[PDB]
Design a protein around this motif. Structure first.
Motif, PDB file in Angstrom:
ATOM      1  N   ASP A   1       0.825  -0.768  -0.368  1.00  0.00           N
ATOM      2  CA  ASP A   1      -0.259  -0.080   0.254  1.00  0.00           C
ATOM      3  C   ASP A   1       1.086   1.013  -0.103  1.00  0.00           C
ATOM      4  O   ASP A   1       0.335   2.205  -0.947  1.00  0.00           O
ATOM      5  N   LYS A   2       2.172   1.595   0.951  1.00  0.00           N
ATOM      6  CA  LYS A   2       2.228   2.291   0.448  1.00  0.00           C
ATOM      7  C   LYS A   2       3.061   2.596  -0.194  1.00  0.00           C
ATOM      8  O   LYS A   2       3.336   3.659  -1.198  1.00  0.00           O
ATOM      9  N   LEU A   3       3.966   1.729  -1.497  1.00  0.00           N
ATOM     10  CA  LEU A   3       4.451   1.948  -2.129  1.00  0.00           C
ATOM     11  C   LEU A   3       3.462   1.961  -3.890  1.00  0.00           C
ATOM     12  O   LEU A   3       3.782   3.364  -4.321  1.00  0.00           O
ATOM     13  N   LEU A   4       2.369   1.972  -3.054  1.00  0.00           N
ATOM     14  CA  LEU A   4       0.795   2.566  -4.618  1.00  0.00           C
ATOM     15  C   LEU A   4       0.965   4.077  -4.332  1.00  0.00           C
ATOM     16  O   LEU A   4      -0.150   4.323  -4.499  1.00  0.00           O
ATOM     17  N   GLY A   5       1.134   4.467  -2.848  1.00  0.00           N
ATOM     18  CA  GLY A   5       0.737   5.567  -2.704  1.00  0.00           C
ATOM     19  C   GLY A   5      -1.014   5.510  -1.925  1.00  0.00           C
ATOM     20  O   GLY A   5      -1.469   6.666  -1.166  1.00  0.00           O
ATOM     21  N   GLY A   6      -1.167   4.744  -0.710  1.00  0.00           N
ATOM     22  CA  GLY A   6      -2.293   4.278  -0.250  1.00  0.00           C
ATOM     23  C   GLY A   6      -2.798   3.355  -0.724  1.00  0.00           C
ATOM     24  O   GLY A   6      -3.574   2.337   0.069  1.00  0.00           O
ATOM     25  N   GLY A   7      -2.507   2.309  -1.613  1.00  0.00           N
ATOM     26  CA  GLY A   7      -3.804   1.610  -2.153  1.00  0.00           C
ATOM     27  C   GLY A   7      -4.193   1.919  -3.810  1.00  0.00           C
ATOM     28  O   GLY A   7      -2.823   2.368  -4.195  1.00  0.00           O
ATOM     29  N   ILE A   8      -4.450   0.322  -4.865  1.00  0.00           N
ATOM     30  CA  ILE A   8      -4.941   0.592  -5.861  1.00  0.00           C
ATOM     31  C   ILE A   8      -6.353   2.116  -5.649  1.00  0.00           C
ATOM     32  O   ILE A   8      -6.726   1.699  -5.721  1.00  0.00           O
ATOM     33  N   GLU A   9      -6.074   2.749  -7.300  1.00  0.00           N
ATOM     34  CA  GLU A   9      -6.966   4.228  -7.438  1.00  0.00           C
ATOM     35  C   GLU A   9      -8.329   3.576  -8.376  1.00  0.00           C
ATOM     36  O   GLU A   9      -7.765   2.770  -8.825  1.00  0.00           O
ATOM     37  N   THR A  10      -8.429   4.282  -8.253  1.00  0.00           N
ATOM     38  CA  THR A  10      -9.805   4.255  -8.630  1.00  0.00           C
ATOM     39  C   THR A  10      -9.858   5.116  -9.949  1.00  0.00           C
ATOM     40  O   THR A  10      -8.674   6.394  -9.695  1.00  0.00           O
TER      41      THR A  10
ATOM     42  N   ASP B   1       8.645   2.761 -14.681  1.00  0.00           N
ATOM     43  CA  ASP B   1       8.365   3.785 -15.157  1.00  0.00           C
ATOM     44  C   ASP B   1       7.074   4.374 -14.445  1.00  0.00           C
ATOM     45  O   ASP B   1       6.607   5.326 -15.140  1.00  0.00           O
ATOM     46  N   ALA B   2       7.745   4.948 -13.335  1.00  0.00           N
ATOM     47  CA  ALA B   2       7.132   5.533 -12.511  1.00  0.00           C
ATOM     48  C   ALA B   2       7.339   6.922 -11.401  1.00  0.00           C
ATOM     49  O   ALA B   2       7.394   6.818 -10.470  1.00  0.00           O
ATOM     50  N   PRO B   3       7.935   7.867 -12.014  1.00  0.00           N
ATOM     51  CA  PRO B   3       9.160   8.650 -11.590  1.00  0.00           C
ATOM     52  C   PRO B   3       8.960   9.227 -10.490  1.00  0.00           C
ATOM     53  O   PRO B   3       9.076   9.954  -9.814  1.00  0.00           O
ATOM     54  N   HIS B   4       7.283   9.485 -10.479  1.00  0.00           N
ATOM     55  CA  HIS B   4       6.393   9.906  -9.389  1.00  0.00           C
ATOM     56  C   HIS B   4       6.456   8.966  -8.558  1.00  0.00           C
ATOM     57  O   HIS B   4       4.885   9.278  -8.148  1.00  0.00           O
ATOM     58  N   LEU B   5       7.055   8.028  -8.606  1.00  0.00           N
ATOM     59  CA  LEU B   5       6.572   7.562  -7.249  1.00  0.00           C
ATOM     60  C   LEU B   5       8.288   6.980  -6.059  1.00  0.00           C
ATOM     61  O   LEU B   5       9.078   7.291  -6.685  1.00  0.00           O
ATOM     62  N   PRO B   6       7.954   7.974  -5.702  1.00  0.00           N
ATOM     63  CA  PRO B   6       9.286   8.121  -4.261  1.00  0.00           C
ATOM     64  C   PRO B   6       9.677   6.043  -4.291  1.00  0.00           C
ATOM     65  O   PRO B   6       9.379   5.353  -3.969  1.00  0.00           O
ATOM     66  N   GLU B   7      10.726   6.270  -4.736  1.00  0.00           N
ATOM     67  CA  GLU B   7      11.405   4.664  -5.212  1.00  0.00           C
ATOM     68  C   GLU B   7      11.185   3.876  -3.622  1.00  0.00           C
ATOM     69  O   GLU B   7      11.769   3.698  -2.929  1.00  0.00           O
TER      70      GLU B   7
ATOM     71  N   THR C   1      -2.133   2.552 -16.281  1.00  0.00           N
ATOM     72  CA  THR C   1      -2.000   3.873 -15.774  1.00  0.00           C
ATOM     73  C   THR C   1      -0.131   4.013 -14.914  1.00  0.00           C
ATOM     74  O   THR C   1      -0.027   4.367 -14.757  1.00  0.00           O
ATOM     75  N   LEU C   2      -0.693   1.815 -14.617  1.00  0.00           N
ATOM     76  CA  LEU C   2       0.306   1.944 -13.149  1.00  0.00           C
ATOM     77  C   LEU C   2       0.925   0.912 -13.295  1.00  0.00           C
ATOM     78  O   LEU C   2      -0.070  -0.041 -13.254  1.00  0.00           O
ATOM     79  N   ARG C   3       1.816   0.051 -13.976  1.00  0.00           N
ATOM     80  CA  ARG C   3       2.588  -1.051 -14.127  1.00  0.00           C
ATOM     81  C   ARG C   3       3.692  -1.958 -12.851  1.00  0.00           C
ATOM     82  O   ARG C   3       4.522  -0.996 -12.609  1.00  0.00           O
TER      83      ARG C   3
END
Lengths: 15, 225
Positions: free
Chosen positions: B14-23, B205-211, B186-188
């Protein structure tokens, strides 16, 4: 089976 | 409209995903056989039904299989072990098996009808799963010059899925089995096995990913840390 069904009915069908 | 976020069952993931999978998004999970993709799909089909303070959206589910993947008893197990009524959770999942890629396309149209029906009820569809999304396209469009038509048909199917996600505020979750071909999610998320029976997830490929990478297990609760 050609279309959606509720999963409780699917469980019963497969049994 | 505000983006909803569905917990995976794993705080790490969930943290990697920014809280969970998005609608309003298509999230694709890909990896080799055994990497955890189907277990994540089954867990999400339970988690989305939870209230939001438990990581869900009080949502219903639609599930399109291309291969024989869906296991109602696994749903029941995951639900029971998370304190839910297993049979009530099954009543909120609508399931279909795609016979071929053309039938798969029709099923997405039919999915829209149920989405519309439930939209203004207290259990709107909030999750649409397509497992092994490319499997029929890959078996049917094969040989010389098949790349162009296959990828064109896929792009259209993905556009239809994006439309449902955005128009009806749904999370679309798709899986695929292991570029250079186009991708339109959207997200892989790449999944693989790790040590000690763990699975490891990495965003591609999600540069707005905090790594980083997430680590999780597959248990009687589905997915957890």
């Amino acid at each position: 089976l050609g279309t959606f069904m509720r999963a409780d009915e699917y469980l019963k069908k497969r049994a | 409209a505000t983006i909803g976020r569905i917990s995976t069952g794993s705080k790490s993931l969930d943290k990697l995903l920014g809280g969970g999978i998005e609608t309003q998004a298509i999230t694709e999970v890909f990896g080799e056989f055994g990497s955890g993709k189907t277990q994540l799909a089954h867990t999400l089909a339970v988690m989305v039904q939870l209230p939001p303070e438990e990581g869900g959206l009080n949502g219903s589910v639609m599930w399109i299989d291309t291969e024989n993947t869906f296991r109602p008893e696994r749903i029941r197990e995951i639900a029971q072990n998370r304190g839910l009524d297993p049979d009530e959770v099954l009543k909120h999942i609508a399931y279909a098996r795609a016979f071929n890629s053309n039938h798969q396309m029709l099923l997405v149209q039919q999915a829209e009808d149920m989405i519309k029906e439930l939209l203004n009820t207290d259990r709107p569809v909030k999750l649409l799963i397509v497992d092994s999304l490319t499997s029929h396209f890959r078996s049917e469009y094969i040989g010389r010059g098949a790349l162009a038509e296959r990828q064109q048909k896929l792009a259209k199917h993905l556009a239809d899925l994006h439309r449902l996600a955005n128009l009806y505020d749904i999370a679309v979750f798709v899986t695929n089995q292991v570029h250079i071909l186009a991708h339109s999610a959207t997200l892989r998320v790449y999944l693989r096995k790790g040590k000690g029976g763990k699975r490891i997830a990495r965003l591609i490929d999600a540069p707005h990913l905090p790594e980083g990478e997430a680590v999780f297990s597959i248990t009687e609760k589905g997915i957890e840390d």
